[PDB]
Structures are given as C-alpha cells and as structure tokens.
Amino acid sequence: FVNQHLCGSHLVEALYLVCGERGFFYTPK
Amino acid sequence: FVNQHLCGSHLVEALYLVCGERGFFYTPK
Amino acid sequence: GIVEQCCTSICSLYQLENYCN
Amino acid sequence: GIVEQCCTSICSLYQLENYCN
Ligand SMILES: [Cl-]
Ligand SMILES: [Cl-]
Ligand SMILES: [Zn+2]
Ligand SMILES: [Zn+2]
C-alpha cells in the first residue's frame, strides 16, 4: 500500500510539529 | 533553537523510512 | 492506531496531539 | 539522545536504527 506509506510520512511530520518538546511514539499497524 | 528543530524534522522522516513497521520514538532536548 | 484514524480521515492538529507523549 | 548524536554528525542507517521501537 504505497499511499498508506506516503500518508505515514506526512503523519510523522505532523506529529513532530504538534508534539514539540514532548516527543512522540510512532506505532503504525 | 531553529537549527536544532530543522534537523529534527529530517530526523523524524529518516526514522520513519528506516524503522518501517517497527516504528520509532523521538524526543527533543 | 494513528494510521487507521488519520489516513482514512483528516486529523486536525488537536486530534494528532493525542499521540504525543 | 538522537538530536545530540545525529545533528552534530552524519548518522548512518544502522545508527538511526537504534532509535526504532
Ligand atoms: Cl503524498
Ligand atoms: Cl533544513
Ligand atoms: Zn506526499
Ligand atoms: Zn530542511
């Protein structure tokens, strides 16, 4: 699923913005 | 620190590609 | 997971905040 | 952390793998 892989690339970029200094864990399916 | 944040943006993208289905954890300083 | 929720529908920044530490 | 190790020097793919889950 290429589009799923492409979507996850934007998701981690989005998380890095919102979470900031708090950090985050990325746990896909 | 803006330069640190710019590097972190590329940090998250590289981890997403390298780690794959395992996922990754990111935490700034 | 985040892929299920946010790749099937648009997630706002507030919705994405739930996945932060 | 990853920022200290990899924003001061170029980290290889294997070095980045240390921060996977
Ligand atoms: Cl895309
Ligand atoms: Cl840059
Ligand atoms: Zn894209
Ligand atoms: Zn850049």
Swiss-Prot record, chains A, B:
Protein name, per record: Insulin B chain
Organism: Homo sapiens
Gene name of the record: INS
Residues of the full protein shown: 25 to 53 of 110
